[PDB]
Amino acid sequence: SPSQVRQNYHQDSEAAINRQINLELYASYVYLSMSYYFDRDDVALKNFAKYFLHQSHEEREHAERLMKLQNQRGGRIFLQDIKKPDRDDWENGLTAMECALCLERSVNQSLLELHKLATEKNDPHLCDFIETHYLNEQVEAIKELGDHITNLRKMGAPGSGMAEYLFDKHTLG
């Protein structure tokens, strides 16, 4: 039953990899929702839409990389239902940035739990994979989101639409 390539790969690690795949695709779905929310005629923030579409594409790559890692170690991929994003209307740019920050913090927390599980199971390859491809990216993404939120708050968002317009033109542009 076990694959000819499976070595030092625990069942719990495989299940955690599958759950992380589902999370990464949920995050991609949420970012797509934000991106096409900012493409609305009553919102009209092109650079916000570009930023969130790029985030969605990145998360899909993260998930595809996770699926490739699952296949490499001899595990079996079990896809689940990709849940809808918790919101349909994202209010404005600052709220979308804060929701994206909350997402990334959750993805990073899940990745930290996965690394802790791999360390407990003595899987050095999985730990190195998580450290190389997912940890520093999460901290850079969280730092970037925090910078964006700080700039939006200081410019006067969300009360002033001039602030969101100028942030769209200068920072994200």
115 interacts with Fe ion by CB under 5 A: no
148 interacts with its own copies by CB under 8 A: yes
Annotated binding site: 24, 59, 62, 104, 138
**Distance, CA of 160 to CA of 46 (rounded, Å):** 18
Residue 47 site contact among its own copies, Fe ion, none (CB < 5 to 8 Å, cut-off depends on kind)? none
Per-position x/- string for 40-69, each x denoting binding to Fe ion as judged by CB under 5 A, each - no binding: -------------------x--x-------
Contacts of residue 3, defined as CB under 8 A and 6 or more positions apart, other chains included, come to 74
Provide long-range contacts, Cβ within 8 A and 24+ apart, for 64-67. 65/133, 66/17, 66/20, 66/21, 66/24, 67/21
The answer to whether the beta carbons of residues 115 and 46 sit under 8 Å apart is: no
The answer to whether the beta carbons of residues 86 and 98 sit under 8 Å apart is: no
**Distance, CA of 129 to CA of 131 (rounded, Å):** 6
Residue 121 site contact among its own copies, Fe ion, none (CB < 5 to 8 Å, cut-off depends on kind)? none
Q: Which is nearer to Fe ion, 35 or 92 (CB)?
A: 35
81 interacts with its own copies by CB under 8 A: yes
15 interacts with its own copies by CB under 8 A: no
Annotated binding site for Fe cation: 24, 59, 62, 104, 138
Subset of residues 28 to 57 that bind its own copies, contact rule: CB under 8 A: 29, 32-33, 36-37, 39-44, 46, 53
Residues engaged in binding Fe ion (CB under 5 A): 59, 62
